[PDB]
Design an enzyme around this catalytic site. Structure first.
Site, PDB file in Angstrom:
ATOM      1  CD  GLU A  11      33.634  46.566  43.915  1.00 28.96           C
ATOM      2  OE1 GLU A  11      34.179  47.649  44.200  1.00 28.96           O
ATOM      3  OE2 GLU A  11      32.466  46.487  43.478  1.00 28.96           O
ATOM      4  CB  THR A  16      35.344  35.893  40.097  1.00 27.69           C
ATOM      5  OG1 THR A  16      34.495  36.936  40.598  1.00 27.69           O
ATOM      6  CG2 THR A  16      34.720  35.306  38.830  1.00 27.69           C
ATOM      7  NE  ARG A 146      31.217  43.242  45.251  1.00 27.10           N
ATOM      8  CZ  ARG A 146      32.378  43.039  45.861  1.00 27.10           C
ATOM      9  NH1 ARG A 146      33.029  41.896  45.688  1.00 27.10           N
ATOM     10  NH2 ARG A 146      32.886  43.978  46.646  1.00 27.10           N
ATOM     11  CG  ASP A 168      38.702  34.104  48.642  1.00 29.98           C
ATOM     12  OD1 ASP A 168      38.549  32.947  49.080  1.00 29.98           O
ATOM     13  OD2 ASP A 168      37.755  34.891  48.422  1.00 29.98           O
ATOM     14  CD  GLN A 172      36.233  45.845  49.796  1.00 28.59           C
ATOM     15  OE1 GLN A 172      36.475  44.816  50.433  1.00 28.59           O
ATOM     16  NE2 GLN A 172      35.780  45.826  48.548  1.00 28.59           N
TER      17      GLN A 172
HETATM   18  N1  LIG Z   1      33.080  41.040  33.188  1.00 27.02           N
HETATM   19  C1  LIG Z   1      33.885  40.576  34.168  1.00 27.02           C
HETATM   20  N2  LIG Z   1      33.432  40.588  35.433  1.00 27.02           N
HETATM   21  C2  LIG Z   1      34.330  40.094  36.331  1.00 27.02           C
HETATM   22  C3  LIG Z   1      35.586  39.612  36.091  1.00 27.02           C
HETATM   23  N3  LIG Z   1      36.190  39.201  37.278  1.00 27.02           N
HETATM   24  C4  LIG Z   1      35.292  39.440  38.231  1.00 27.02           C
HETATM   25  N4  LIG Z   1      34.158  39.981  37.685  1.00 27.02           N
HETATM   26  C5  LIG Z   1      32.890  40.404  38.466  1.00 27.02           C
HETATM   27  O1  LIG Z   1      33.276  41.497  39.245  1.00 27.02           O
HETATM   28  C6  LIG Z   1      32.722  41.372  40.569  1.00 27.02           C
HETATM   29  C7  LIG Z   1      33.613  41.363  41.691  1.00 27.02           C
HETATM   30  O2  LIG Z   1      34.464  40.179  41.810  1.00 27.02           O
HETATM   31  P1  LIG Z   1      34.770  39.520  43.179  1.00 27.02           P
HETATM   32  O3  LIG Z   1      35.320  38.087  42.682  1.00 27.02           O
HETATM   33  O4  LIG Z   1      33.635  39.423  44.126  1.00 27.02           O
HETATM   34  O5  LIG Z   1      35.947  40.458  43.610  1.00 27.02           O
HETATM   35  P2  LIG Z   1      36.881  40.395  44.986  1.00 27.02           P
HETATM   36  O6  LIG Z   1      36.296  41.502  45.883  1.00 27.02           O
HETATM   37  O7  LIG Z   1      38.271  40.646  44.490  1.00 27.02           O
HETATM   38  O8  LIG Z   1      36.648  38.993  45.522  1.00 27.02           O
HETATM   39  C8  LIG Z   1      31.881  40.064  40.601  1.00 27.02           C
HETATM   40  O9  LIG Z   1      30.490  40.512  40.389  1.00 27.02           O
HETATM   41  C9  LIG Z   1      32.384  39.286  39.405  1.00 27.02           C
HETATM   42  O10 LIG Z   1      31.415  38.427  38.884  1.00 27.02           O
HETATM   43  C10 LIG Z   1      36.074  39.598  34.764  1.00 27.02           C
HETATM   44  O11 LIG Z   1      37.195  39.190  34.407  1.00 27.02           O
HETATM   45  N5  LIG Z   1      35.148  40.107  33.820  1.00 27.02           N
HETATM   46  F1  ALF Z   2      34.546  41.542  47.855  1.00 28.87           F
HETATM   47 AL1  ALF Z   2      36.256  41.923  47.762  1.00 28.87          AL
HETATM   48  F2  ALF Z   2      37.946  42.303  47.699  1.00 28.87           F
HETATM   49  F3  ALF Z   2      35.854  43.566  47.364  1.00 28.87           F
HETATM   50  F4  ALF Z   2      36.650  40.272  48.139  1.00 28.87           F
HETATM   51 MG   LIG Z   3      36.096  38.459  47.390  1.00 26.86          MG
END
Ligand SMILES: Nc1nc2c(ncn2[C@@H]2O[C@H](COP(=O)(O)OP(=O)(O)O)[C@@H](O)[C@H]2O)c(=O)[nH]1
Ligand code: ALF
Ligand SMILES: [Mg+2]
Length: 313
Positions: A11, A16, A146, A168, A172
């Site tokens: 997360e 994103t 999400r 990417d 977790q």
């Molecule tokens: N407000 C806000 N939400 C964000 C930001 N970056 C990501 N998010 C939100 O946080 C959530 C998790 O991001 P995600 O890209 O799925 O995270 P990942 O697990 O690292 O790929 C998503 O619902 C996004 O839309 C940010 O800079 N600001």
């Molecule tokens: F959904 Al993730 F790292 F929590 F890509």
């Molecule tokens: Mg992701």
């Protein structure tokens, strides 16, 4: 050809940043693609309101108005339709009344005590719009979705005459074993850190501070000799959420020694130094740090433009 690898704890905003490439370098998401996310927006919304209602029982928080009890019952009876990409007017009313309840809001403002999507408020506050019949997700709606990443995702796009191959992975603990499959020929690593994670705990381990988890991962990646010649870009993401959170949640929860005020600039810089200091070879290894809001296309466009120039150089 350039290979970019997005790393970071769960997360942190990796996926994103990937979505933004399509918006910035491609024509954005088409109507058909946006419609695919309609069920995700609905799922996210229903899951968020349910997460809060779940927490109310755990934290023993009552509804502000007794009448909400009936709405809560109807929520589960009608939830199924939303999961299938359908949003009835009845379901919208139920969710709307629940969201406005003072008890629900009290619990919402204590979200650090449980697990809640960061986009919860974004969708709930815009219920009237997303509940419209024939609703079509906007680019921002898609960016706010999400969808947990399990595995490896490869995305392609052209920018400044360069052919980018972006990868990417999931962040977790259970997904990190897969990171090594992407270690070959990496031009640059974009390591994402959720700035607003400083007062949260891991969903996979309630005893671990999310920020401390990010630090250990960055320490591992940044100092891995295998990446000695790979550009390390650090994205201190979710700066927008951090800006609001730092005003009311002590940073000392994460860093006991922080002596600064509850303000953005002082705290942001402090966190930056915490991560940059993990670099064991400051003289031979450069870290390119950028503060970002992954859902803000304009911010990412300019930050990514700066990142590409460094990569070209
Ligand atoms: N407000 C806000 N939400 C964000 C930001 N970056 C990501 N998010 C939100 O946080 C959530 C998790 O991001 P995600 O890209 O799925 O995270 P990942 O697990 O690292 O790929 C998503 O619902 C996004 O839309 C940010 O800079 N600001
Ligand atoms: F959904 Al993730 F790292 F929590 F890509
Ligand atoms: Mg992701």
């Amino acid at each position: 050809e350039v290979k970019l690898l997005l790393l970071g704890a769960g997360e942190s905003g990796k996926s994103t940043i990937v979505k933004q490439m399509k918006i910035i370098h491609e024509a954005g998401y088409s109507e058909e693609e946006c419609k695919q996310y309609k069920a995700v927006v609905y799922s996210n919304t229903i899951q968020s309101i349910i997460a809060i209602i779940r927490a109310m029982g755990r934290l023993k928080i009552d509804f502000g108005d007794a009448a909400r009890a009936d709405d809560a019952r109807q929520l589960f009876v009608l939830a199924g339709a939303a999961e299938e990409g359908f949003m009835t007017a009845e379901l919208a009313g139920v969710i709307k009344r629940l969201w406005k309840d003072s008890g629900v809001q009290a619990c919402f403002n204590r979200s650090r005590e449980y697990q809640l999507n960061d986009s919860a408020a974004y969708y709930l506050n815009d219920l009237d719009r997303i509940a419209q019949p024939n609703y079509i997700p906007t680019q921002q709606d898609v960016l706010r979705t999400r969808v947990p990443t399990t595995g490896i995702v490869e995305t392609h796009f052209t920018f400044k005459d360069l052919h980018f191959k972006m990868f990417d992975v999931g962040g977790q603990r259970s997904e990190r074993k897969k990171w090594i499959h992407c270690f070959e020929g990496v031009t640059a690593i974009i390591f994402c850190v959720a700035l607003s994670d400083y007062d949260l705990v891991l969903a996979e381990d309630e005893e671990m501070n999310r920020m401390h988890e990010s630090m250990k991962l960055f320490d591992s990646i940044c100092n891995n000799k295998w990446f000695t010649d790979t550009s390390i870009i650090l994205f201190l993401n979710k700066k927008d959420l951090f800006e609001e959170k730092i005003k009311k949640s002590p940073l000392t929860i994460c860093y006991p020694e922080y002596a600064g005020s509850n303000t953005y600039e002082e705290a942001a810089a402090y966190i930056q130094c915490q991560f940059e200091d993990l670099n064991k070879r400051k003289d031979t290894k450069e870290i390119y740090t950028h503060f970002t809001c992954a859902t803000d296309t304009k911010n990412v466009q300019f930050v990514f433009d700066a990142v590409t120039d460094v990569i070209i150089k």
